[PDB]
Nucleic acid binder design. Structure first.
Ligand SMILES: [Mg+2]
Ligand SMILES: [Mg+2]
Ligand SMILES: [Mg+2]
Ligand SMILES: [Zn+2]
Lengths: 422, 387
DNA sequence: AGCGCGCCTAATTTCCTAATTTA
DNA sequence: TAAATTAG
RNA sequence: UCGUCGGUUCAGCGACGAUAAGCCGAGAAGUGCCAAUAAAACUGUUAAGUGGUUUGGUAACGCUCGGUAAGGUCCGAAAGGAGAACCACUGAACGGAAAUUAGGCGCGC
C-alpha cells in the first residue's frame, strides 16, 4: 500500500524566498518541456515503426536504430542538452511518466479513441527516493534536504550542496514523519506542489507501508444504499442495527453556491472595465474560485462520509461491504441533486476498507429499492418514492432507504433478482 | 460573416441507410489517415525530424506542405473526393503551422484527431434544393470517380434534411441568394445515432438604423434594480442588483466595526454609486442601441419599496439621458401612477412578486409588467382615462 | 417564449524504478 | 559519493 | 456579503481588509484588423472560373504572462517598512498528481 501526505515549506535554510522561487519556476518550465518532448519522441517512434514494417515486413529494433533499448533512453539523451537545470534523476523520472503514458495507451492512440497527451503550464517537480531526505534537529525543527539541481546548475546558481527547507510537521503529519524517520515507512518518489491560493509550496511525500488487517468474518456483509431522503443508509442482515448520513449540511451548501454562481454570471454582462482585456484567467477568476470551493467541499464531505461507513463496518465486525454499481444507472433522483461526485466517494470507501481488511463488492442496483427484504416479492407498482415501503403481502413497513440497504446486504442479491425477475 | 447551423439528415433518397452508413464509414477512415499522415509530413517538412529519421534506414520536389502531403496521401485515400481531400489536408497543416512554435518550445506535444472525425465538404460539393411538395433535398458530392464506379453510385448522393423554424429562415435565404454557402461538414453523434450536416453561410450583416417608433421602457422594480422591455419585440433585459445587496451588507458591517472613519466610508459609498451608475447607464443605452429603439421612457423623478433603497436616482437618470444623446436616442419622462397595477395585455387597471390580472389573467413578474406599460408611447394619457 | 452552443462536471486509468558507473 | 545513465 | 493570517480541506473563533463581482503593467505565441502579394487544390479542349496564400504592422480580444488589501509583537510621528526576527485557538477529516473521455447543461432567443 502507498499513501501521500503534504508538508508546507516555510523557508529555504540558506537562500531567500525570492531566489528560491526563481529556481523553482525555472525547473517547472523544464519539467513541462521534458514531458511534451518525450511524447513527441514517443509519437515519432510509433510512426517510424509502422512505416518500417510496411517496407521490410518486421518491426525495427530500438537498439539497432534508436541506439537504446527503449524510447525512454533516447528521450533522456536528447532532452538532457536542453533541460540541463533539473537533476538527472528527477529528469529521468519525469520522462518516464510521459513515455509510460504513451506506451500504456498506444493502441488507443492509433485507433483514435484517445488524444496525444499535452501537458499544462504549472507542473509538479518530480523527486526521486534517493534525492529527498528529512532530518529532525535537536531543537524540534524538521529540515528536508532536496536534490533539485544538476552540476552545471549548481555552479551557475552558487549552490554547492542540497537546498534545505523547513517543513511544518504537525498533527497527523508528525506520526507519519516519525515512522518515516524510524523506518516503518519507506519514502517513494515524491513531488513538490505549488498552490495558487495562499501562495504556498508543498512537499508531497509518498510512502510505502504494510497494512495491519484484523481477521474479520467474511460472511458479515454491510449494505450501502444512496437513498432519496437520506444521503446514505447502512444496514446489516444479521443484526437489526441501522446507521445513516442525513446530509443536512450538504443541502445548505448548495443553496448558497447556486445563488452566488448565478449572480456572478449575470454581472459579467455589464462588469467593470478591468474585467476584460487581460486574458482568460482574469475574466473567469470569480467563477474559478467558486468552482474550486465546491471541489474542496466535496472532497472533505466524501472523506468524512467514507470514514464513517468503514468505521461502522469495523464496529459490527463486518468483513465485506456491498454497494451499488453506478455505471449503468444514469437517472440520479437521489438526495445528491447537485450531481455529487459519486466516483470519488466510492473510491474512498474502497481504499479505506482495504486498509482495514474489508473487501468491497459492487452489486447491480436493479429493483433493489423495489424488492421487499422480508418476503422477497418484487413489484414495480410501488415505485413512487413515498419515503415508506409498505409491502402488499409481507405487511412490513420501514424506511425506503433502510429497506434498500438491507437488500444490498444480502449475498448474491442481484442473482436472486436475476433468477426471478418479477 | 460566416456562421454555422446543423441540419439533421433524415434518410438517403436513392440508397438504403445500411449502404449509406457503410459508405460514410469508409470515408471517415480515410479522413483520419489524411489528417494523421499530414501531421507527420508537416513534421518532416518543417525540420522537426530527428537524426535517425534521415540517417538510419529511411528538395522533395514540391513547394508547399499541402502540395507535398496531397499527392502522398492521395494514393491511399482514393475514395475521398479530390476537392474534399484538399480541405482535410489543409485543416491538418493549418493547425500544425499555428502550433509550430509551441511544439518547438515544448508547450504542446502533437495535434491529434479523434475516431469519428467529421467529413469535410467544400463549396461546389453541397447544393440544396426545395421541391414542389416542400421537401428539402441536399445533394452531396463525396466519392471520387474510382469510388463511384466500385460502389455503384452514378451521381451525387442526395439526402433529406429537416428545416424547422430558424432553420427554414436561413435555408430559404440560402435558396433565395442572400446567404451563400461557404463550407460544410458531416458530423456524426453517437448519442442518438444520427447524422448531422451543418452549413457555414456567409452574409453581409445589416446595421440597425435608429427609428422613432420603438420605445424602450425602464421600471425601477421591487425585485431588481431595473427592467427593460419593449412592445415591438418580445425580448427583455434585466439589471439585477446582486452586487448592491452585498455592498449594503459590507457597509453595515463596517459601520459596526468602526464603532474620519465615517468620512472615508461616506466617500467610499459615494464612489460606488457613481461607478454602478456608469456601468448601468452604459448597459441600458447598449440594449437600446442593439434593438435600435429611438426613444427611452422612464418614470419621472421616492425610495419606496424599490430594490434600490435611497439610491442616487437623479444621477442615474442624467447619465442615461446624457448617454442616450450620444447615440441619437431621446429620453421622455412619464408619470408613474398605477403603472405596476395596469395590465399590459388587456389594458384593464386593477402578490407583488408576480402580477396577475383579475380579468386578463396574465401572470408575470411585476417588474416586467411595469416595464411594458412604460413602453407605450401614450401611456401617460391612458393612465388618467380609467380615472 | 426552442434546438444549437462550447464546455464543465463527473467518470476513469496509471503511477508512486533500480543497478551500475563516472566524478 | 551523490549525480548520471540506461536496461528490463 | 466575500476574503486574509492561525501546518492542508471543511466548519467556527480572535484580529483585519474590501468599489476586490475592483484597479493596473509589460509582451507579441494565437484569433480578429490594416498595408503590400496571390501559392496549394479542384472544375475545366480552351477561355477562364471557384479557393485564399505569403511577409510586415497594429494592439480590440474568454490574447499570453504578471502586479495589486487584509493577525498580533517591532521600527517608524502616522503612512510606510528589506517573505527582517518572535508569537497565534476549537471540532470533524487527512491518498495525491497528471492525463483522457463522454454526456447534459447554463448561456444562448
Ligand atoms: Mg440513487
Ligand atoms: Mg479557516
Ligand atoms: Mg486544526
Ligand atoms: Zn415483500
Amino acid at each position: 500500500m502507498i499513501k501521500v501526505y503534504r508538508y508546507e515549506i516555510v523557508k529555504p535554510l540558506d537562500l531567500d524566498w525570492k531566489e528560491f522561487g526563481t529556481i523553482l519556476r525555472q525547473l517547472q518550465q523544464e519539467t513541462r518541456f521534458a514531458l511534451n518532448k518525450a511524447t513527441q519522441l514517443a509519437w515519432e517512434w510509433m510512426g517510424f515503426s509502422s512505416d518500417y514494417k510496411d517496407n521490410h515486413g518486421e518491426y525495427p529494433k530500438s537498439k539497432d536504430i534508436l541506439g537504446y533499448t527503449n524510447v525512454h533512453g533516447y528521450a533522456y539523451h536528447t532532452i538532457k542538452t536542453k533541460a540541463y537545470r533539473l537533476n538527472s534523476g528527477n529528469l529521468s523520472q519525469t520522462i518516464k511518466r510521459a513515455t509510460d503514458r504513451f506506451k500504456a495507451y498506444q493502441k488507443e492512440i492509433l485507433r483514435g479513441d484517445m488524444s496525444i497527451p499535452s501537458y499544462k503550464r504549472d507542473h509538479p517537480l518530480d523527486l526521486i527516493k534517493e534525492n529527498i531526505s528529512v532530518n529532525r534537529m535537536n531543537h524540534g525543527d524538521y529540515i528536508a534536504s532536496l536534490s533539485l539541481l544538476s552540476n552545471p546548475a549548481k555552479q551557475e546558481m552558487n549552490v554547492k550542496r542540497k537546498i534545505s527547507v523547513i517543513i511544518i510537521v504537525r498533527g497527523a503529519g508528525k506520526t507519519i514523519m516519525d515512522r518515516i524517520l524510524s523506518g516503518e515507512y519507506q519514502v517513494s518518489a515524491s513531488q513538490i506542489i505549488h498552490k495558487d491560493r495562499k501562495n504556498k509550496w508543498y512537499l508531497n511525500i509518498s510512502y510505502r507501508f504494510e497494512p495491519q488487517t484484523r481477521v474479520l468474518d467474511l460472511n458479515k456483509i454491510m449494505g450501502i444504499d444512496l437513498g432519496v431522503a437520506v444521503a446514505a443508509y447502512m444496514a446489516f442482515q444479521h443484526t437489526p442495527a441501522r446507521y445513516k448520513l442525513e446530509g443536512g449540511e450538504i443541502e445548505n451548501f448548495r443553496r448558497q453556491v447556486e445563488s452566488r454562481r448565478i449572480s456572478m454570471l449575470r454581472q459579467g454582462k455589464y462588469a467593470g472595465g478591468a474585467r476584460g482585456g487581460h486574458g482568460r484567467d482574469k475574466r473567469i477568476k470569480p467563477i474559478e474560485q467558486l468552482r474550486d470551493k465546491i471541489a474542496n467541499f466535496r472532497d472533505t464531505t466524501n472523506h468524512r462520509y467514507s470514514r464513517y461507513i468503514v468505521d461502522m463496518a469495523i464496529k459490527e465486525g463486518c468483513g465485506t461491504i456491498q454497494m451499488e454499481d453506478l455505471t449503468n444507472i444514469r437517472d440520479i433522483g437521489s438526495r445528491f441533486l447537485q450531481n455529487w461526485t459519486y466516483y470519488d466517494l466510492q473510491q474512498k470507501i474502497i481504499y479505506k476498507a482495504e486498509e482495514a481488511g474489508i473487501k468491497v463488492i459492487k452489486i447491480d442496483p436493479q429493483y433493489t429499492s423495489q424488492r421487499c427484504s422480508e418476503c422477497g416479492n418484487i413489484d414495480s407498482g410501488n415505485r413512487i418514492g413515498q419515503a415508506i415501503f409498505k409491502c402488499r403481502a409481507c405487511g412490513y413497513e420501514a424506511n425506503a432507504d433502510y429497506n434498500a440497504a438491507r437488500n444490498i446486504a444480502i449475498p448474491n442479491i442481484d442473482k436472486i433478482i436475476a433468477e426471478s425477475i418479477k
